[PDB]
Amino acid sequence: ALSKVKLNDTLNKDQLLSSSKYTIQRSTGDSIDTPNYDVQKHINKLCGMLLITEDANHKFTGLIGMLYAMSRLGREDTIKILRDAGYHVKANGVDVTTHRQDINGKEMKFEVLTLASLTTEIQINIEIESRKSYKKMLKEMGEVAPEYRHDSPDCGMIILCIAALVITKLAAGDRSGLTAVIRRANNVLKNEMKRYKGLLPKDIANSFYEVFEKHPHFIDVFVHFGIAQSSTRGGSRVEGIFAGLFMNAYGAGQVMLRWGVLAKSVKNIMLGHASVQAEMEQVVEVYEYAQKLGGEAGFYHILNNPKASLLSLTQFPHFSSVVLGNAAGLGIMGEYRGTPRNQDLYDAAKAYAEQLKENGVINYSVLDL
Amino acid sequence: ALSKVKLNDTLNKDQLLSSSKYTIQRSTGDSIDTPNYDVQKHINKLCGMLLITEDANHKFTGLIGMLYAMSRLGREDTIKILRDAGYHVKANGVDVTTHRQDINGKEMKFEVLTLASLTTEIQINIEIESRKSYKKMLKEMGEVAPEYRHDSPDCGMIILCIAALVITKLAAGDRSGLTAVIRRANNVLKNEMKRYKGLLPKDIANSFYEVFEKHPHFIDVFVHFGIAQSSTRGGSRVEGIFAGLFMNAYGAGQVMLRWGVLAKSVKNIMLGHASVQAEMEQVVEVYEYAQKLGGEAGFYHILNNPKASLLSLTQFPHFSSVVLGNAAGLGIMGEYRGTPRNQDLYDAAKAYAEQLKENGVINYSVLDL
Amino acid sequence: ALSKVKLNDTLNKDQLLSSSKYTIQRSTGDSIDTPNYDVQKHINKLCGMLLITEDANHKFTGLIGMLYAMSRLGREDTIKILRDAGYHVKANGVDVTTHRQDINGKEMKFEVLTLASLTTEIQINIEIESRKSYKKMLKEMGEVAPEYRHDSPDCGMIILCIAALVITKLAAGDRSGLTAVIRRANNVLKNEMKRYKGLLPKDIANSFYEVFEKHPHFIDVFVHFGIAQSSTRGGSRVEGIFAGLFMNAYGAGQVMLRWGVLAKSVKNIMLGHASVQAEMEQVVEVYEYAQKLGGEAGFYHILNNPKASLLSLTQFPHFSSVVLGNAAGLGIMGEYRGTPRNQDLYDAAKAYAEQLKENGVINYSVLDL
Amino acid sequence: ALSKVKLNDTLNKDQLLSSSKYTIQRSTGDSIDTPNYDVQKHINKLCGMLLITEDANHKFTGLIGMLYAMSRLGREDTIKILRDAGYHVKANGVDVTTHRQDINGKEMKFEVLTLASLTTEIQINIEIESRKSYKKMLKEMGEVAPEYRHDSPDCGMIILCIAALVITKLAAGDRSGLTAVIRRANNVLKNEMKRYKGLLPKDIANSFYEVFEKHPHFIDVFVHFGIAQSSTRGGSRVEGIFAGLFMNAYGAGQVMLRWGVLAKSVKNIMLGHASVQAEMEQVVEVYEYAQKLGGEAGFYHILNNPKASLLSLTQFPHFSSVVLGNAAGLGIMGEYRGTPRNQDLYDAAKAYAEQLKENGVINYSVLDL
RNA sequence: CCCCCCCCCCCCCCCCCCCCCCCCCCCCCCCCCCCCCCCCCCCCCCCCCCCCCCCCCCCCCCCCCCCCCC
RNA sequence: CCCCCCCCCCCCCCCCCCCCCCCCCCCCCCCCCCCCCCCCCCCCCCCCCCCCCCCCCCCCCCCCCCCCCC
Questions:
Q1: For the stretch A188-203, what's the b/e string if a residue is b when 16 or more beta carbons lie within 10 angstroms of its beta carbon?
Q2: Residue C257 in contact with residue C287, Cβ under 8 Å?
Q3: Is the CB of B304 less than 8 angstroms away from the CB of A37?
Q4: CA/C1' separation B283–E18 (Å)
């Protein structure tokens, strides 16, 4: 029977990758600092001092946000995440200590952290800039409120909201989503961009881009922190904003699956073409694979999971071209920089999707009605 | 088959969030006072003294109501709630002690509580104001009744009724439901607003708004206290009022689901439009998700649960516009400040819902009858 | 039942027009000459003399061709045709006689016809021109053949072939099909355009246009002559050419019916639009009417039959626009000067018909396959 | 319903042509000789004298064969045929008479016919040539047999066999089938081409071509004579040869119908193409029309019947191209000078028909087997 | 990003039952005859036949993926 | 009372055909036998029986219809 001349390549590749009986273990290189719940207050203080500092220097904001996320997770869970990701990690204990230095010819008390990645001078200078900006702004408006201070419990979570936007745009492969990050961080968080002098979305976004590029394990740590944070029973409104912006990253890098479901929903006719119907077997194969994967598959491209390539639909040029055409016809493709590889099917689907709005729907009374 | 080109994104996101294998643990900052059953009588006395004090100062009423709720729960359950919500809490023991001070040049006996959040001066001044207001009102009417006193066992529960109204309106994101809270606290509790001189709904509502804004864990504590209180076998009539006002908050922030069920019930025709039928698959997805969640989902938006965004229907502009139009046509939309994002479907549904009252119903004898 | 809210207007109009119990009888004005079988040879001689005359004057060729057709029909059938068409006719007997005149100072014998419409001078001058052209061409090539002479039995039928082309293009309402007539008379009849010096398609076509414009009863006579000629058991090859060119006129003025059948055959999707399906009832009404009429309906527009307007499809703007779009997309519309009255449906159908050639066909596996 | 958007143009045209209520009547011009059964022996004698005359002059053989056919039919049936064909005929009586002339200075008795088309000198000279050729051949071989004489009763029927071959090739429109006529008259009738000195196929074929070109009514007369001859109960072997060669002309000019039936029989796949299936409705229309016509339709193109154009299949370019391709692939198209108007379908069908011989047949186990 | 409206609940009437009535009552041990069963003939098998025998390595192309908005 | 609007229609391209091909061809009479058919016994019926039988007139009331608008 010709019906059994078939090969389930996607499922077989998945079974090969999921049934490996040997494991690799990478070496991060530089030692990882693992803060615990103890220093969460101090890291939040540092984030607040960065936020209240106008004309601020955000060169180290990405690392400080990563430290805050790791302190929220806790040392045990951070270590367990790093092992489960397949890393050899030098767990570095983080504890708070005092440092005494004379600036302006006056003895001064600073409370800093033992971070191998972040030197004492940097934290001291962050405090100095924050203090003098606070002095100037207190002079210019008289009395402060808990709104204008580093002691707010959500100062770190605003920085992590910026990180969540960066994560949403990470799947583009470079810093091309920086403009989108800035635009969305101006739409969202506009009250904060009033309230905090140093909340500069572009600088923080660039810092997080840099830290994610240099340390790929921080992407894994941040994704699992975002999943753990989104699994809480509740929280403040800033944590709700972070959860909403983080789940905006679900399915990033897999827009074609959603647009294919959309093209099925609007019932585009060019799904009835000969070549599309030729590829439909493996297309349904891919969709069933995505469903069997389920929730974990939504962050494959952000995490650079090796099995991300199994979810691709560009390996079916005709179906992909029809899907892109339908997306462009419905007016939702935007600046999507993926290009069709069957221009004719793309144009036909685009035209039909455009007439799907002036000419509402097409019946199929043809053929017996 | 084109029927298997589908993705269950809502369910996959829920499974991802519910199957997390790492947890975060937040730090509240300031220490939490955890009163036990021992001081419930004293906290109720404090609430009664606040209530019988005319021209009262309600700056601290929200914290005192929170303390009363936590004392009703007990220290064990309050601590367990705070852990289950994912908080690091400094459990502060609350016990009663005496303080002696000379006011009016006379030695005076006061019995106060060891609360870190509430200083002794504040409790002393509350007692002073209550005592002199009691003296003045006793002078002006001769003899008091158990109706006019702080020893009533429901004085704290009236304050918690005001808190329940504030909770009902918390999902609006700000203090825009203050007018509704005042109106409902005048409709309900009018006998009390006679009986208690200091029962000022606006001041207590503002105090509870402030305490819920500053301490997001108090929202969790109060919601679980309200659920535990509503699980009792019975109580007084004020506790019944509190239970009725608290379950008025169930489903807050999710009005569109109820209005969609309503639009299905009145059988609005614009549910048969092309785009609405395109979105119906994911709409049924969302409704099945809400049902699988069940009872716990009714307080997701009040608690700022991260999975609250999964219940949204505004991600389907056509269905949402039809639902808003049907609600506006039936005359129940009120001042709902959500706006349609398909004006045409909104207007069509509104018009049909309006003719659903003069022109009772429409048969579908068209097509074969 | 809403299914019986229907009116069969086309069929009712046809029954009203076909069941009239009173008749009109028009008056042609000028007397009609009715030649019989006797003078068929002489009229064919006259046509041959016109054909062999180079640089000829074809002012009277249309009338002579009409006389030849009427002589082929016979006087009885010509009279019966004129009565059945509803005309009052002065039947004029045509017989041959001799006329003697002196040209070049020499007595000369001419044999002419008693035609009221055609004077003796005209026939004499036709003979003179033919004779001297024959003399010149005999001088220039030495000896003639039966190919180069007026005695050929098909000289009149060539002129009637030109008349048949003019009839094919008569439905345009004016002399706009003259170029098409000339082009087709050059493609066909090229051997004759060699063989006959005076076979000028444009002059003969203009003469036939003039005679059909002045005498509308000659259109009826010629159409019924063409039907009678095409009902013969056989004939020469020129008669076969005439029959082929005459049946090319069948269905002239009713191209939209054929193009609608074509759009049904290529299964254009825009036949499934809402408005097209609204009009489909009356469209099927018109097609059933055309079929009930049958063969006689193919010459309604040429004859200016009053019931020609009942076969129109432009009374359904959406279906007509779809049909024109399908015709233009398939590349067969040419210079058809009818214009769509629904531009959107026209463009949509044109686009789909164009993709019907690169993208062969579209299956309807959508909806359950 | 879209299924009733249809027009039966072929059948409607046939009904229009078959239901004409007026008739034309052509004039042959020159008078028709109508021999009766009386002079059949003399006309057969003339044909035999032409046949036994070596190096003969066949300028008049076509007319003599026509006279023999008309004498076999009889005067009554010849006249009735000419009327039924729609001709005005001057019936000329043919009778035998004697003419006396002195050749070689000697009185000589000749018995000739009163034929207006054939002068006495021609018959006399035919007899002279036959007599002297007979004398020379009798001298050269001594004694004659009934094989070598003009008195054989089939001498006229051999000439009519040559006429039958010419009729088979008449549908080509010119004298392009002359080579085929000569080849078939050499294959058949080779014993006669031994036996008769003047049986020159090319000269007789040219004479019959000429007479059929000049007198189109002789084609009708000969076709009906051949039908009447083929309706006899029996005859000689030469009459059987004539019947076989005459029914070889049945269906001449309609090869595409037979080749389409053939392409259906060999089950060519390109009959499943989209455009072919578009045209299949009108193709089946044409085939049903041909079957309804039946036997009379086999001589439409030979007789130049006006309804011959209704049997054409070239009005369906795709089906015609597939049919020509299948014919060329099977190796039976020969020098058929009709050309495809869809080269692609022609080539595809030709290729499949070629692989129909090395690769016997193709099953359709594809799709469920 | 999400969200945004309105809304305490309840309210009536109401005991139920009520009579009459013990049940049973007759007749009737069961069985009973005749009959042992079996009975013949018959070892089974018997031939022919080892099996195998050809041809044949397989492979060979192209291809990172992603990119929108929220 | 009813009615009340708008609206001529048409418009393109296109003669058709074209090849090959006589048919047939062998063998063959059929039949063949046997056979008359029938054959017996037998009349049928047979009794009893007239049928019917009573009671019974039927009916009984009320009630014109209609009414608007168009």
A1: bbeebeebbbbbbbeb
A2: yes
A3: no
A4: 65
Exp. method: cryo-EM
Sign of the CA dihedral C172, C173, C176, C180? positive
CB contact under 8 A, C273 and A362: yes
Distance CA C61, CA C53 (A): 12
| Test the A interface: residue of D3, D5, D362 with most A CBs within 10 Å | D3
**Token digits for B274?**
């092309």
CB of D49 within 8 A of CB of D130?
yes
DSSP C243-305: HHHHHTTTTTT-HHHHHHHHHHHTT-GGGGSHHHHHHHHHHHHHHHHHHHHGGGGGGTTTTT-
Question: What are the φ and ψ backbone dihedral angles of D190, each rounded to 5 degrees?
Answer: -70, -35
Residue A244, judged by CB atoms within 10 A of its CB (0-12, 13-18, 19+), counts as: middle
* DSSP structural state of residue C107: E
Termini Cα distance of chain A:
35
Please give the backbone phi and psi of residue C87, each rounded to the nearest 5 degrees, phi first: -130, 145
Q: Where are the alpha helices (DSSP H) in B90-170?
A: 120-141, 155-169
Whether residue D308 and residue C240 make contact (CB cut-off 8 A), yes or no, is yes
Nearest DNA or RNA nucleotide to A337 (CA to C1')? E67
Tokens of A306: 């090796």
Q: Which residues of C touch D27 (CB under 8 A)?
A: 37, 40-41
- Structure letter (DSSP) for residue C31: P
Calculate the CA C243 to chain-centre distance: 11
What distance in Å separates the CA atoms of residue A165 and residue A65, rounded to the nearest whole number? 13
Q: Note whether B211 and B127 are within 8 A (CB).
A: no
Interatomic CA distance for residues B159 and B189, integer angstroms: 11
Are B112 and B67 in contact by the 8 Å Cβ rule? The answer is no
Residues of chain B with Cβ-Cβ distance to A357 below 8 Å are none
Q: DSSP characters for D103-145?
A: ETTEEEEEEEE--SSS-HHHHHHHHHHHHHHHHHHHHHHS---
**Cα–Cα distance, C238 to C241 (Å, whole number):** 5
- Are C231 and D20 inside 8 Å of each other by CB? yes
Dihedral sign of CA atoms C201, C202, C205, C207 in order: negative
Tokens 């946000």 -> residue: A65
The alpha-carbon gap from A250 to the nearest alpha carbon of chain C, in Å, equals: 29
The total of other beta-carbon atoms located within 10 Å of residue A7's CB is: 10
- Which two structure tokens, joined as six digits, stand for B68? 């009363």
CB atoms within 10 A of CB A31: 12
Q: How far is the CA of D104 from the C1' of F22 (A)?
A: 46
What SS3 class is residue C43?
helix
CA separation, residue A356 to residues A124, B259, D188 (Å): 62, 29, 71
- C-alpha–C-alpha distance, residues D323 and D280, integer Å: 13
Contact B205, B165 (CB under 8 A): yes
Whole-angstrom distance, CA of residue D86 vs CA of residue C231? 10
Residue of A nearest to B301 (CA): A234
- The token pair at A121 is 């001078």
Q: Which of D297, D296, D268, D264 is nearest to D283 (CA)?
A: D264
Where are the strands (E) in chain A, listed by range? 26-27, 32-34, 87-88, 91-93, 96-103, 106-113
Q: Which residues pair with A107 in a beta bridge?
A: A102
Residue D110's contacts (CB-CB under 8 Å, 6 or more residues apart) are D98, D99, D100, D101, D123, D124, D127
Q: Are A43 and A71 in contact (CB under 8 A)?
A: yes
Q: How far apart are CA B226 and CA B242, in angstroms?
A: 8
Q: Which amino acid is at A187?
A: N
Tokens of C354: 């164009």
